[PDB]
């Protein structure tokens, strides 16, 4: 319930879909007998997320990550809501939401 909570939950879904897309891209990148990353790419994503000073940089990285994720439906249905949520709100809060999505993305894969 509550509009803010629904927006937060479906933004978590958006971020989880984006990480699914990025992880699929990494899976496609690797070849041969080398073991494709699963956990260390998550650690890389964590390191890149914490590497974020001020706002401009974090929003740039978040937008780049979302685009690199590729196709996603939760952002498809909700354009205005997530656009306003990302444009507004402190960047630290959005980083907290992104980390919370990271910690709970894995049930998908």
């Amino acid at each position: 319930n509550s509009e803010e909570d629904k927006q937060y939950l479906i933004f978590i879904k958006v971020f989880q879909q984006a990480m699914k897309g990025n992880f699929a891209k990494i899976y496609a990148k690797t070849e041969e007998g080398k073991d494709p990353p699963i956990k260390k790419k998550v650690e890389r994503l964590r390191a890149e997320l914490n590497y974020c000073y001020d706002e401009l940089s974090f929003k740039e990285y978040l937008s780049d990550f979302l685009v690199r994720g590729g196709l996603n439906k939760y952002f498809n249905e909700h354009q205005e809501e997530i656009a306003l949520l990302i444009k507004k709100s402190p960047w630290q809060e959005i980083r907290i939401w992104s980390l919370l999505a990271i910690a709970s993305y894995k049930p998908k894969d």
Partner: protein, 288 residues
């Protein structure tokens, strides 16, 4: 009397990756935080400058309790009991022996973190271990920053065990060795290029950070309008003000400079002449 030597020194323009933060991932980040106008500036810790001053004191002879090995990268103490009377470093920087003459000393030098004059926007440098083989320690990133640095310090000269030890400290501030950082790939000389020193006998300074930028992405540096207003209004006695460096040209190019009270300060374009005059005044005042 209680004589204090306050001063704000501005470094030279150059790529600087002097003080870093927690290792994080593959990217070494600078020590940065909000400084002015809500913009993020890069910082150099004052402990780095204190270490550089200690290294200068060690290199130019002198007696220092802490001796940097410079070969094993280890610190050795000549005497386990700190003696500020004999050793320069104990007299100047103090000590604190907590493990369990006094065991603690406040030191005569007080420094503040060096603040980049220019906001830190981007400036991440790609680094590769090269070769054809790749591994975990192959692709790394290092943050740098093309800016001048500016720090503020204050000396309680009367607190020194030996009053004559202030002169080597001024010499070290002038000919400062490398400040801790990646000098292999980012060699940043920390020698001053503009000085605003004040040799007064009261605690108020008002000269903490007198340098401010123009065109925030440029190397040009000017004296802050607040400092000039402080000088002109009557505060900050010009006879106690020592200004030297490349800011001298900009100060002299100002309109109505001759009529301004700033003209009565000790202004020397050559830093060596300004330091010599200031040391002459200090020796006269301290009875050296």
């Amino acid at each position: 009397p209680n004589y204090y030597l306050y001063g704000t020194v501005l470094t030279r323009y150059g790529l600087a990756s002097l003080n870093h933060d927690i290792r994080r991932g593959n990217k070494t980040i600078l020590q940065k935080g909000y400084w002015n106008n809500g913009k993020i500036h890069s910082f150099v810790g004052s402990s780095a400058i204190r270490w550089a001053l200690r290294f200068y004191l060690q290199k130019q002879g002198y007696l220092v309790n802490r001796v940097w090995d410079e070969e094993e990268h280890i610190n050795r103490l000549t005497s386990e009991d700190f003696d500020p009377e004999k050793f320069y470093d104990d007299d100047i920087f103090g000590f604190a022996l907590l493990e369990s003459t006094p065991n603690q000393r406040m030191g005569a030098l007080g420094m503040n973190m060096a603040v980049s004059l220019t906001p830190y926007d981007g400036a991440v440098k790609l680094g590769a271990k090269s070769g054809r083989e790749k591994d975990s320690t192959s692709l790394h990133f290092t943050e740098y920053h093309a800016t001048r640095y500016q720090y503020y310090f204050g000396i309680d000269a009367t607190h020194l065990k030996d009053f004559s030890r202030i002169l080597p400290m001024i010499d070290g501030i002038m000919n400062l060795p490398k400040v801790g950082g990646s000098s292999n790939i980012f060699n940043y000389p920390f020698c001053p290029d503009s000085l605003v020193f004040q040799w007064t006998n009261h605690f108020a300074s008002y000269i903490s950070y007198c340098f401010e930028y123009c065109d925030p992405k440029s190397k040009e540096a000017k004296l802050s309008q607040e400092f000039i207003d402080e000088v002109e209004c009557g505060q900050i006695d010009p006879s106690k003000l020592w200004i030297g460096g490349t800011i001298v040209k900009d100060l002299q190019q100002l309109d109505n400079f001759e009529s301004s009270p700033l003209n009565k300060a000790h202004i020397y374009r050559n830093r060596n002449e300004m330091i010599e005059a200031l040391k002459t005044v200090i020796k006269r005042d301290l009875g050296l």
